[PDB]
Structures are given as C-alpha cells and as structure tokens.
C-alpha cells in the first residue's frame, strides 16, 4: 500500500533533518574524529605488526543522506536495487572530519582499511570514484574490504590481521562495525554489548551517529527485516516507550 | 487539525526508536562521557580559580524520551504546559555515563553546575528529586542555574564565573549549551559555528546526540516556532536534501 509506504518513510523525517541540517550532527562527527586521532596517536602495536585503523564507510566516512531524502520524497522503503543506483550516481558526500582523519592516519605510519557493506561486485567503482573526488588518500582497491558473501564484518577484520596488521581502533556507526557478537541480534542484546564495553567508546571503538538505519532497526523486533511495511510500522510504534501522562 | 498533529509527531518516530532502543545511542553517550573525563583530568585553571564543569540537563544528563513517546502516542506537539506535568511526574531517566562523570568531577576537585532550561519556578522540585533518585551527587539547589527570564544560557555561565570558577568544559546536546553566538539563528549559521570550533568538540565542548528536538529544529526555517503545525511540517519537508534518482 502506498499509504503504508508513506507512513513508514515519514517516520524518518525529523532524524533526517537533524543529520542533514544541524550543526549538532557536525559537532558529533568532529568529536568522534578528534577522539579517533587521540586514540591513534596513543596506540602501540606488537613488535613486527603494522598499525591499522578499520573504518566503516556508509554513515561513518561517507554521507548518503540524499538517498534517504529520495526515500522520503518518493515513499520508498529501502531496496538494494535502488541503493546500487544511488552508489552509481556518484553523489556521496564526506562525513565531517573523516577525510582529515583518514589522511592523517595514512601519513603517520598507519593504514586505514575500509570494511564496508557496499558491494564488491556492483558498487566498488562508484565508491572509489566518490572517495577520490572527496579527497580521501589511500583509496587503492586493496584498501577496501567490500561485501562479497557475508554482511557480518569480523571475517574481514581477520583478513586484515592475517596481512600483518594490528587493528588499533575501529570507526563505525553500527555496533556490527566492531565485531560479530551482536550481529543479527535484538536491541536488548546490543545494549548489553555496549554496557560490557563501556570504556572502549571514544577510545578503541569510535562512534558516529546514525538515526536513519542500521542494525538497531532490525533490532526493534524478531524478524523485522522480513516483515511487510505494515509490520515494520507496527514494530517501530510498539517499541516506543511512552509516559502515560500521569504523575 | 488532528491529521496534521499526527503527521508532525510521526516524523519523530524513527529517531525516537534510535534514542530509546539502540545500543548505538548508548555507545555515543559513553563516548561523550569518556572524552569528558579525559578533558576534565587534563584541565588546568588560572591561579585562584576553582574548576567548574557546565552541564546541560535535558537530553544531556537527563533522558526525557518517555515524554517524546507520549507525544507520538497522543499526536501532541510540544507544549510547555505538558512539559511541566512531565517534570512533575518524576520519571526522568539518566543518560548513560552521566551520573558517573558528574560524581567523578565532584569528587576530584571540580564542581558540576547544571545550566538548564527547566524552569526555576515550576520545574525545580521534580528535577532535584529525580536527580537525587538517579544517583547524582552535588544536587543542592545552588548547583542549579534553571531558567528564569532568559532561555539563552551565556548569562548563567557568566554568573558561575563571577563566583570564582573557571569553566573547563561544557557538556550539551544543543549548540546553545556552549554560548549565545548562534542562539535563535538558522542552521547555516549554526553549522558555521561548529566549523569555526572544530577542534573543541570532544575536548572542551562535549556533545550528546538528540535527534528529537532542539535549536536545530527552530533552525530549519525563519520563524519556525511561530508557524502552525502545517507550516512546521512544510519546513521540515522543504529542508530535506534529496537525490533526484538520476545518475
Ligand atoms: N536505510 C537502509 N536500510 C537498510 N540498509 C541500508 C540502508 N541504507 C543503506 N543500506 C545498506 O547498508 C550498507 C551499509 O552498511 P555498513 O557498511 O554497515 O555501513 C549500504 O551499503 C547498503 O547496502
Ligand atoms: N520537543 C521539544 N521541543 C521544544 N522544546 C522542548 C522539547 N522538549 C523539551 N523542551 C524544552 O526545552 C528544555 C530543555 O532545554 P535545554 O536546557 O537546552 O536542554 C526543556 O526543559 C523544555 O522546556
Ligand atoms: Mg555504516
Ligand atoms: Mg538539552
């Protein structure tokens, strides 16, 4: 139903305004990348290891908000086929602070590896072109670990380590950017992971804000991503914790 | 119109789910407070000065998300009269990491002052009771600079300084928590302020995420807060930056 599609996408509007328009969002991005530089500079690795930083792309280093805007204007739920066209459109922007941090790491005895669920086979060319255009250094193909057969990221982290790197910090907008332990899990388990790692945030796990999509959306209800539009609307509304209006 | 009220408040749903349910939100809160502790510990003040930290309350140290949930469920635009009842309901929660940071500052030769637009005359009792209940130390009345005649906060910062304190850092969720220079201004000016202070974020200006309300909402359009519901809906939708769907 068109009505259901409109309701689902309208629910994203205020958070999208915040991410696209607010100074507050920019300030959070700068805060993250300022903290990331401090962590990188402090990091020491085992003898014989090279220093690596693992960075997520979408909503961490790359800003895809115009795709979300298109969803709002056209009442379009997320669809990977539309996403591939967005990537091919080569209109990605950079998250504030990301290029400077990336280039700093790469010029100070580190290497940033991009572990990203953009698709290796269909979305690589647009990604690399946009990143070159946006000013990122170190965007040769071998810096990228794009999605092949698995959306969970830990195996790609292990590939990086096998190449003689020690990962000194991770940058992401989704807890699944830090490992697999809450991949596919609901939000209670995801919050528990965060509590169990409280001291790592702003140190070895660097967070960017994303109020628009992610593992937390699927985390709203069992089987969320397989539900129809009406089911997803209901899952979102049922997750709301509301004051009852009484004293 | 009830329809307009519903549309306006539905636009907050996804960001509310993110703030209430996601581990990612918690991780951002811990990141902020972890960075804040590092900044506090590093801070040195002028001879003869006492060390102060200025902290915002709403959506910085206190979590009012159930009020937003009530707005969603009842299609209620923000109204200060409802807000006063929410405060009186004494159901505020603590933002993750806030109590620990607050109590650490207060036990390590600093003092946290709460500069907050909760109302001194009608909202003080609930605020203090909730904070005591939530575990905050140092919540005697004189620690609070609640709203009297002005929503802009710089004059209250100056009052703190007049009492012999040097403010070593500010914690907030709204750029107006750091001074007055973009108070009442639109988002272009607010983003410019952030760019002009890029290096301070995560150091002396500590940010918490708030995708639900703030100076950035008013910043969406000239006279936003005086517009009717339909006008505010239009302002939000007109602010959206959307991909045109072409390559
Ligand atoms: N709104 C959305 N909902 C679900 N998946 C999305 C959305 N937007 C983008 N994606 C997908 O998620 C990927 C980003 O994953 P990640 O590398 O974890 O940032 C994108 O490359 C898309 O395949
Ligand atoms: N959704 C909202 N829209 C506008 N104002 C709000 C909203 N929620 C709370 N407020 C007001 O803003 C104050 C918080 O301001 P601050 O001290 O900057 O965090 C609250 O005490 C309320 O008076
Ligand atoms: Mg991402
Ligand atoms: Mg606030």
Q: In angstroms, rounded to a whole number, what is the distance separating the alpha carbons of residues B153 and B115? A: 7
With residues binned 3-state (H G I as helix, E B as strand, rest as coil), the percentages for chain A, rounded to 5, are 50, 15, 35
Q: In angstroms, rounded to a whole number, what is the distance separating the alpha carbons of residues A14 and B240? A: 10
Angle at A180 between CA A176 and CA A186, to 5 degrees: 70
Q: CB–CB of B30/A201 below 8 Å?
A: yes
Within a 13 Å sphere around the CA of A169, how many CA atoms are in the beta-carbon half?
A: 26
Q: How far is CA B151 from CA A8, B58, B124, B127, B226, in A?
A: 35, 13, 15, 17, 16
Angle at A70 between CA A69 and CA A71, to 5 degrees: 90
Q: Mark B25-54 as b/e (b = at least 16 C-beta within 10 Å).
A: bbbbbbbbbbbbbbbbeebeeeeeeebbbb
Which of A201, A210, A244 lies closest to B34 in CB terms? A201
Q: Who contacts B119 (Cβ-Cβ below 8 Å, separation ≥6)?
A: B84, B146, B147
Which CATH number characterizes residue B33's domain? 3.40.50.1000
Q: How far is CA A30 from the centre of its chain?
A: 16
Which of A14, A23, A210 lies closest to B194 in CB terms? A23
Q: Mind giving me the DSSP string for A106-134? A: HHTTEEEEEEEEEETTTSHHHHHHHHHHH
Q: Who contacts B34 (Cβ-Cβ below 8 Å, separation ≥6)?
A: A198, A199, A201, A202, A203, B97
Q: In angstroms, rounded to a whole number, what is the distance separating the alpha carbons of residues A21 and A137? A: 27
Q: In angstroms, rounded to a whole number, what is the distance separating the alpha carbons of residues B36 and B29? A: 11
Q: In angstroms, rounded to a whole number, what is the distance separating the alpha carbons of residues B142 and B156? A: 12
A242 touches chain B (CB under 8 A): yes
* CA dihedral over A238, A241, A247, B6, signed as positive or negative: negative
DSSP-assigned beta bridge partners for residue A54: A113, A170
Q: Mind giving me the DSSP string for B54-92? A: EE--BTTTEE-HHHHHHHHHHT----HHHHHHHHHH---
By alpha-carbon position, which residue is closest to atom 16 of ligand 2? Answer: B117
Question: 3-class DSSP state for residue B120?
Answer: coil
Q: In angstroms, rounded to a whole number, what is the distance separating the alpha carbons of residues A240 and B14? A: 10
In angstroms, this model's resolution equals: 1.4
Q: CB–CB of B205/B90 below 8 Å?
A: no
Tokens of B168: 């070593």
Q: In angstroms, rounded to a whole number, what is the distance separating the alpha carbons of residues B188 and B220? A: 9
Sheet strands (E) in chain A: 50-55, 62-63, 93-94, 110-119, 144-147, 165-172, 205-207
Q: In angstroms, rounded to a whole number, what is the distance separating the alpha carbons of residues A101 and A34? A: 8
How far is ligand 2, taken at its centre, from the CA of residue B103, in Å?
Answer: 24
Q: What is the largest CA-CA distance in chain A?
A: 63
Q: How many independent structural domains does chain A possess?
A: 1
Q: Who contacts A115 (Cβ-Cβ below 8 Å, separation ≥6)?
A: A54, A55, A56, A145, A153, A156, A157, A160, A177
Q: In angstroms, rounded to a whole number, what is the distance separating the alpha carbons of residues B175 and B191? A: 9
Tokens of B153: 């906060």
Within a 13 Å sphere around the CA of A120, how many CA atoms are in the beta-carbon half?
A: 14
Q: CB–CB of B26/A193 below 8 Å?
A: no
Identify the CA nearest to A217 among candidates B19, B28, B18.
B18
DSSP-assigned beta bridge partners for residue B235: none
The answer to whether the Cβ–Cβ distance between B27 and A194 falls below 8 Å is yes
A174 lines ligand 1 (CB under 6 A): yes
The answer to whether the Cβ–Cβ distance between A32 and B202 falls below 8 Å is yes
Among B5, B58, B123, B212, say which to mutate for ligand 2: greatest number of ligand atoms within 8 Å of CB.
B58
B94 touches chain A (CB under 8 A): no
How far is ligand 4, taken at its centre, from the CA of residue B217, in Å?
Answer: 13
Q: In angstroms, rounded to a whole number, what is the distance separating the alpha carbons of residues B164 and B174? A: 26
Question: 3-class DSSP state for residue A143?
Answer: helix
Tokens of B15: 């960001």
Q: How far is CA B109 from CA B49, B50, B51, B54, B91, in A?
A: 11, 8, 7, 14, 31
Domain around A13: 1-247
* CA dihedral over A33, A35, A36, A42, signed as positive or negative: positive
Question: Phi/psi class of residue B195: alpha, beta or left (left: φ > 0; alpha: ψ in -120 to 50)?
Answer: alpha
Q: How far is CA B79 from the centre of its chain?
A: 17
Q: In angstroms, rounded to a whole number, what is the distance separating the alpha carbons of residues A128 and A136? A: 9
Question: 3-class DSSP state for residue B208?
Answer: coil
A5 touches chain B (CB under 8 A): no
Q: CB–CB of B188/B222 below 8 Å?
A: no
Contact list, B13 vs chain A (CB under 8 Å): 11, 236-237, 240
DSSP-assigned beta bridge partners for residue A147: A119
Q: CB–CB of B208/B28 below 8 Å?
A: yes
| A205-207 and B93-94 beta bridge pairing | unpaired
Sheet strands (E) in chain B: 50-55, 62-63, 93-94, 110-119, 144-147, 165-172, 205-207
Taking the CA of residue A142 and the nearest CA in chain B, the distance in Å comes to 26
């Amino acid at each position: 139903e068109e009505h259901a599609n409109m309701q689902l996408q309208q629910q994203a509007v205020l958070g999208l305004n915040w991410m696209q328009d607010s100074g507050e969002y920019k300030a959070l991005a700068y805060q993250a990348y300022n903290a990331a530089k401090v962590a990188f500079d402090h990091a020491k690795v085992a003898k014989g290891k090279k220093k690596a930083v693992v960075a997520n792309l979408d909503e961490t280093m790359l800003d895809n908000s115009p795709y979300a805007g298109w969803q709002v204007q056209n009442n379009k739920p997320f669809d990977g086929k539309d996403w591939t066209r967005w990537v091919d459109a080569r209109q990605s922007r950079a998250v504030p602070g990301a290029v400077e941090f990336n280039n700093y790491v790469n010029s100070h005895n580190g290497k940033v590896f991009y572990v990203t669920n953009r698709k290796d086979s269909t979305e690589k060319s647009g990604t690399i072109d946009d990143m070159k255009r946006l000013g990122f250094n170190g965007v040769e193909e071998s810096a990228f670990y794009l999605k092949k057969d698995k959306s969970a990221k830990a195996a790609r982290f292990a590939e990086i380590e096998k190449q003689g790197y020690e990962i000194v910090l991770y940058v992401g907008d989704n807890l699944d950017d830090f490992g697999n332990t809450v991949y596919g899990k609901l939000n209670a388990d995801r919050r528990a992971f965060v509590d169990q790692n409280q001291g790592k945030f702003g140190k070895t796990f660097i967070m960017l804000p994303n109020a628009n999509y992610g593992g937390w959306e699927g985390g709203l209800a069992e089987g969320y991503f397989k539900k129809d539009t009406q089911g997803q609307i209901k899952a979102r509304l049922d997750a709301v914790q509301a004051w009852d209006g009484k004293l």
